[PDB]
Every structure is written in C-alpha cells, then in structure tokens.
Design an enzyme around this catalytic site. Structure first.
Site, PDB file in Angstrom:
ATOM      1  N   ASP A  74       0.854  -1.177   0.000  1.00 27.42           N
ATOM      2  CA  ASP A  74       0.000   0.000   0.000  1.00 27.42           C
ATOM      3  C   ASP A  74       0.893   1.232   0.000  1.00 27.42           C
ATOM      4  O   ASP A  74       1.657   1.450   0.946  1.00 27.42           O
ATOM      5  CB  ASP A  74      -0.928   0.006   1.211  1.00 27.42           C
TER       6      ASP A  74
ATOM      7  N   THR B 280      -3.554   5.364  -3.023  1.00 25.48           N
ATOM      8  CA  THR B 280      -2.535   6.348  -2.673  1.00 25.48           C
ATOM      9  C   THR B 280      -1.385   6.301  -3.667  1.00 25.48           C
ATOM     10  O   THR B 280      -0.841   7.341  -4.071  1.00 25.48           O
ATOM     11  CB  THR B 280      -2.029   6.081  -1.257  1.00 25.48           C
ATOM     12  N   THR B 281      -1.012   5.089  -4.073  1.00 26.63           N
ATOM     13  CA  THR B 281      -0.107   4.901  -5.193  1.00 26.63           C
ATOM     14  C   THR B 281      -0.574   5.715  -6.385  1.00 26.63           C
ATOM     15  O   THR B 281       0.210   6.434  -7.012  1.00 26.63           O
ATOM     16  CB  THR B 281      -0.060   3.423  -5.570  1.00 26.63           C
TER      17      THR B 281
ATOM     18  N   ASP C  94      -7.706  -1.279   5.597  1.00 24.73           N
ATOM     19  CA  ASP C  94      -8.002  -0.496   4.403  1.00 24.73           C
ATOM     20  C   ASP C  94      -9.417  -0.767   3.917  1.00 24.73           C
ATOM     21  O   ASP C  94     -10.151   0.158   3.552  1.00 24.73           O
ATOM     22  CB  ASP C  94      -6.990  -0.818   3.303  1.00 24.73           C
TER      23      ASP C  94
END
Lengths: 60, 50, 99, 522
Positions: free
Chosen positions: D56, D89-90, D386
């Site tokens: 993540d 987020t990547t 998540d």
C-alpha cells in the site's frame, strides 16, 4: 543587601518559577520511616512500586 | 469606509488585502472572512484580534 | 488428610499504615498474650479440622514449625503457585484462603 | 561583512524547480509497480531490524524519509489521502508526479505559473464535477443489493491488494462484521486477535467478543470453564488487599483493637465478595487486579474472575454484551448486569482466549485471523483495515466508480475532446494535463509486462465512440466493459485525488527559490 532595581518582569517570573519548583518538590515529601512489609505481598512491591520512584530494597 | 458591518462591503474591502495570496480564488475566502467577522464584531465600541 | 493454605503462620499485618500505641507494661503483656494465643489458635484450628498434612504457599516461622511437629502433624511450606493449584486439583480438596 | 550568516546557500529560478521536479520523479518511481492485482511487493529494513513489508503506497511513503521539500509534500499528501480514503494512494502520488514530469520541459521556454495554475485548478474543478455526475450507484436501497455491492467494492479494493483467492470470502466476512455494528461506526469496537498457525482461509468473525486471558495467580483451574447462560458484571474495582486511600493511618492502643481492625479489613473484602456473589453474576471482569483470596473464593463458589483487562476490551464488552461498567458494587442490580448464553475459555493455536458469545445484543466484533508470519498477518490486517476504511466511507454515500483503469481513460478522453474549444496556451497546457492523465492503466499493463501502448490505443478507440466502462483485464490481458466485472470503487476517492493533485501541482509550480539555514540545531 540584594536590591538595586526591580524590573518586576523577569524577577516576578523568577518568583513564579521558584514557587512552582517549591510546590513540586514539597508535594513529594511523604516518607521518613523504614517500613516492615511481609513476604506474602512481596510480588506486589517488587513490581507494583511506581515507575520513576527509586526503591531501596533492604534485606536483613 | 462606511460601516464595517455589512457583509458585501467586508468582502469588497478585505479581498483587496487578499489578492496577495491565492490568485486563483478570491470570492470564496471573501465570503468566509466577511461572515466570520460580521458575526464576531460587537459593532459597538471595542474589538480584539484574539 | 491435607488442608491447603495461602497464608503464613504469623500474626498478620494489615495493608494500611497501622500504629498501635503502647503506653503500659500491661499493653506489653497484652502483645505477648496476643502473639502466643494467635499461634496456639492457629494450631487448634488446623489440627481440629481433622487433617494430617499442611501446605504453605509463602512459608512461615519456625515457631509454628515446632508447633506442627510436636503436634505430630506433617506439614510443608514455600511451594509455587500453580504447583499448589495442581496439588489441590489432584487431591480434590480446596485451598482455604484463611483460618 | 557577509550580509547573511555564514553557511547558508540558495538555488533559484529554473534550476531550483528542475531539481524539485527531478526529486518528485525519483521518489515517484520507488512505487512504480505496487498497485494492481498483480502487484509486486517491496521491503524496508530499519536500524532495529524490524523489517516491514507492504504494497500500500501511502504506508510505503511513510516507511521512507526525505529532506527534499517537494518529496516531503508528496509524502504528506500521501498521509492525507490515506487518512481520507486509504486506497489508490499509489495512484494519486504517481499521477501528480507525471503531471509535474509532463510540465517540466515547459519551464525552459516562455511560460509562467499563472496560466498553468489557473488551468490546473479549473480542470480539477471540472473533472471533480464529472466525478460527481457520472459516478455509478446502486440507487436501490434494498439490503441484498446493498450488501452485494459492499462485497463487490471490497473485492475491488482487493483487486489491487495482496490476496486474490479470498475476495468474496473476506468481503462477505467484513460486510457482516460491520453489519453487526451500530450507526455510530466507532473505530474502537473492532477487536483484532492475530493468531499464530492456522490457514489464511481460517480467519473468522467472532459474533460476540473474545480476548486474551491475562496472567492469573494460583488457585485457578478449579473454576468452571463452561456455562450455558452466564450473567456478566463489568467492573473497574480492585479485589485486592489495599489500604483505603493510600494515606489512611491507624492509631489504636491494644491487641484487641488490632485484631478487630484486621478482621474488619477481611470483612470489607468478604462483604464485597458477598455482594458480588449474591448479585447473581457468574463472571467478573475489570481493569483492576483480583486478589488471590477472591480467586480462591470464586473457585470455591464455582465462579469465574478476571482482572487487569485492557479498557478497549471492556468497552467492547459493554457495547456488545449489553451490561454497564461498574466502579462500585453497592448498587448492583439487574439492569447493570450483562448476559450471554455461552462462555468458554477455548484454545485457538496454543493460546488461552476467553470467549463470550450468545449475547443477543452485538455492536462490536473481534476478528480472529490465522496465519504463519507476523509480517504477513500484519500486511493482511493492514489490508483489512483499508477495506474497513473504504467501506466505512462508502457506506454513507453508496455511489462508486469502476476500477481497472476504465474511469481514468473516460476522464482523459473527456478532457481531450473538450480541450479543443479552450484557447491558446491554456489549451496546450490542458492537453498536457489530459495526456498525463493516461498512465495508470498503462502502468498496470507494464506491471504485468504487457504491451501497454497497444492496449491503450485499442481502449482509446473503444472509448471514443463505442461505449464506456471499458477496463483492462490481466488474466485475459484484453479490453472490454470490465465495469460488469464488478471492480467498483468509490468516487469520493476520485474527488480527493483531484483535490490533492491540484494542491500539489499548484504548490510545486509556485516554488521559485529556497534559502537553507546552516542547521546548527542538530
């Protein structure tokens, strides 16, 4: 024999810090008699004796 | 300056100080600041920035 | 026949800071009588309930040791906690917290 | 005399911003492959040897540190997105990075921050409005479809995360786990017990509440380890021989007073015990330690006792069981008492966990997950967290968007075809914006080692005037309407992504010069 002028700003500040120091140090004066606890409770003060307080564990 | 009390006047005035920041959006911050200040000002005799 | 105790053989001290005021030789003799009667009543209690073996978790004093001896009642002391727990489990009896 | 203090320096103009863009790309490429179902995982090692492994991106960026301003902006924006959404987020860090990359050459020739910032902000606004207007939703309000799409979005979350064989399995698990929760949606009422051994498939959901049995003194193992409908009392009181208020003093004069006082302390203890026992409860729990006398009494009275319980455990106990926390026992009555139909001290992988189920009320859950690695269990738990975050955000606004790169190509196409009416350098820079908007599916394809150029060409052709919602499959390596493959994710993620992207772009393009203190404060 110590006064030439008083600026009342840093010097009253000195009283304030001094009184905070004094109350902090005199709020801890709780001891003065070595005490004879028993071995049955011993586990409870070898461990549950407060963190930040030195323990002089005398055996005799 | 007329009143320092109405909202649109506050927007029009303070936006001028605002152009030094956020060139891409003006009216939004004007609404925010005008509403807040009109709410906060006692409008009578005194003020503190605090 | 065994009884299982978690307390020593000694006049206990309370958890609170205790101060017994002594002002008379009469209080001195009162303390002496108190300790002697305490030991003797401990012995009377244990030997009276009908056991033969005693086990002490936190040990005790040699005075009670000889009191148990000349009473001809075998006893043991100073045993680990879970050890005593399994002992009571196996014997089917019960650990009495106090006399 | 030197104008400023010795030791400082400063870079300015085009060189400074060029170095900043370079730093942005360097930090960006560090996570070039993480996202995607076929994601390929990274590792970090610290000076303590506590090596950490995650895919993540946001967590990854925290795992790394910089001293560059732009990269610090990037990592803090990653923090913000993770606290906001917790997925993709990547995607956001990458996308801002290529926008900055795509704009790099424009600084060497005539162009100013004004026009580029205005274009970025207006494009972000319009695209956010597009996000709102074309986000897909159930629009059904029936619990069956609601649950189904919650699980579909969960597997969508797992459609770029680690596990891929338990997607529906864990999706239904977590959806039920949250459906035994209230409308408060508290983030403290989710118990987590990582269990050594046991298969990944063996992770489960405790309907009641389980926890770890803390250390206890002797006299245990005589207590009844089973009851068919016990009643629970939730305490925060001490059952140990203690002085009254730690300052009490005793002043007596004869041995009789001494004996009376000590027996009186015993009477206090045994009276509290009598109140507890006669209250009718079969188990007692508390933060406070339980003295061995009380344990021996309860074993003699066939009752279970336990103390030193962490607060959150007790909080879950109240929130599910239906009891009430006690600091006192004098007013113990029926309404205070909890109640359940099952108690047992079960064994789950070499451990002693206390299990309390059979409570008709249940507003908290305690996950029991099984595995063989602390780190891999930690990563799975992180992915569970998540998923919890994504569903908790989405459970409010039941409107989503299809993953698999379909929506990104939709928005890129929208910007491109609309960026033919807008005028001049604004048009050119917006076209650069749109072109930078065409990487994430390409990066997914190249993550799997696919000819991303051809794939993007064909999907662009299909998107132009032949339908929408076309995503890229990886097991099929082809293009089709993969929205009906049900890889669907929320759209507030998209809006927050655009907000952060515009923020970062306008921030770093606003960079002009920096002075560096000699940093004697080390």
């Amino acid at each position: 024999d110590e006064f030439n002028e008083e600026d009342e700003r840093a010097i009253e500040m000195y009283r304030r810090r001094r009184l905070a120091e004094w109350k902090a140090t005199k709020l801890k004066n709780k001891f003065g008699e070595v005490l004879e606890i028993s071995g049955k409770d011993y586990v409870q003060e070898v461990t549950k004796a407060g963190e930040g307080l030195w323990v002089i564990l005398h055996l005799y | 300056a007329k009143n320092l009390r109405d909202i649109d006047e506050v927007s029009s005035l303070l936006r001028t100080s605002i152009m030094s920041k956020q060139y891409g959006n003006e009216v939004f911050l004007a609404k925010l600041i005008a509403q807040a200040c009109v709410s906060i000002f006692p409008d009578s005799g005194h003020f503190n920035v605090d | 026949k065994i009884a299982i105790l978690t307390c020593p053989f000694e006049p206990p001290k309370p958890k609170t800071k205790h101060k017994l005021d002594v002002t008379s030789v009469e209080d001195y003799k009162a303390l002496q009588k108190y300790e002697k009667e305490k030991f003797e009543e401990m012995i009377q209690q244990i030997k009276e309930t009908g056991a033969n073996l005693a086990i002490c978790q936190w040990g005790f004093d040699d005075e009670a040791n000889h009191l148990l001896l000349q009473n001809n009642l075998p006893a043991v002391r100073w045993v680990g906690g879970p050890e005593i727990e399994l002992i009571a489990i196996a014997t089917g009896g019960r650990i009495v917290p106090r006399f | 005399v030197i104008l400023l203090k010795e030791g400082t320096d400063s870079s300015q103009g085009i060189p400074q911003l060029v170095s900043n863009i370079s730093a942005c790309q360097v930090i960006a490429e560090a996570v070039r492959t993480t996202l995607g179902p076929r994601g390929m995982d990274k590792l970090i090692v610290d000076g303590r040897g506590k090596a950490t492994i995650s895919n993540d991106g946001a967590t990854i960026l925290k795992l790394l540190d910089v001293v560059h301003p732009a990269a610090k902006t990037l990592v803090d924006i990653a923090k913000s997105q993770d606290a906001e959404v917790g997925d993709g987020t990547t995607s956001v860090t990458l996308l801002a990075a290529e926008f900055l990359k795509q704009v790099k050459p424009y600084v060497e020739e005539g162009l100013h921050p004004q026009i580029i910032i205005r274009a970025f902000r207006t494009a972000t606004q319009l695209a956010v409005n597009k996000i709102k207007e074309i986000a897909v939703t159930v629009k059904k309000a029936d619990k069956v479809e609601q649950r189904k799409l919650l699980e579909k979005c969960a597997m969508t979350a797992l459609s770029s995360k680690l596990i891929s064989q338990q997607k529906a399995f864990f999706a239904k698990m977590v959806v039920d786990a949250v459906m035994m929760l209230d409308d408060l949606l508290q983030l403290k009422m989710i118990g987590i017990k990582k269990v050594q051994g046991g298969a990944l498939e063996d992770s489960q959901l405790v309907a009641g509440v389980a926890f770890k049995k803390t250390f206890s003194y002797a006299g245990f193992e005589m207590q009844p380890k089973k009851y068919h409908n016990p009643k629970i009392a939730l305490l925060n009181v001490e059952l140990e021989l203690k002085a009254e208020k730690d300052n009490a003093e005793i002043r007596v004069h004869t041995v009789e007073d001494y004996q009376a006082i000590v027996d009186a302390e015993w009477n206090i203890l045994y009276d509290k015990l009598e109140k507890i026992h006669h209250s009718g409860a079969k188990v007692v729990l508390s933060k406070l330690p339980i003295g061995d006398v009380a344990t021996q009494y309860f074993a003699d009275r066939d009752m279970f006792c336990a103390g030193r319980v962490p607060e959150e455990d007790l909080k879950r106990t109240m929130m599910a069981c239906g009891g009430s926390i006690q600091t006192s026992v004098n007013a113990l009555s029926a309404d205070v008492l909890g109640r359940c139909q099952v108690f047992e001290e079960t064994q789950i992988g070499g451990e002693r966990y206390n299990f309390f189920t059979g409570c008709p009320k249940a507003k908290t859950c305690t996950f029991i997950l099984r595995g063989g690695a602390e780190q891999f269990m930690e990563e799975t738990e992180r992915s569970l967290h998540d998923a919890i975050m994504i569903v908790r955000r989405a459970i409010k606004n039941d409107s989503v968007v299809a993953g698999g790169g379909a929506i990104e190509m939709e928005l890129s196409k929208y910007l491109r075809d609309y960026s033919r009416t807008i005028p001049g350098k604004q048009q050119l820079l917006i076209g650069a914006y749109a072109k930078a908007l065409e990487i994430i599916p390409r990066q997914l394809c190249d993550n799997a080692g696919f000819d991303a150029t051809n794939i993007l060409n064909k999907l662009r052709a299909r998107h132009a005037q032949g339908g929408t919602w076309y995503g890229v499959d990886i097991n099929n390596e082809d293009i089709a309407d993969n929205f009906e493959a049900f890889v669907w994710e929320p759209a507030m993620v998209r809006i927050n992504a655009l907000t952060a992207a515009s923020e970062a772009a306008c921030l770093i393009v606003s960079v002009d010069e920096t002075i560096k203190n000699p940093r004697s404060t080390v």
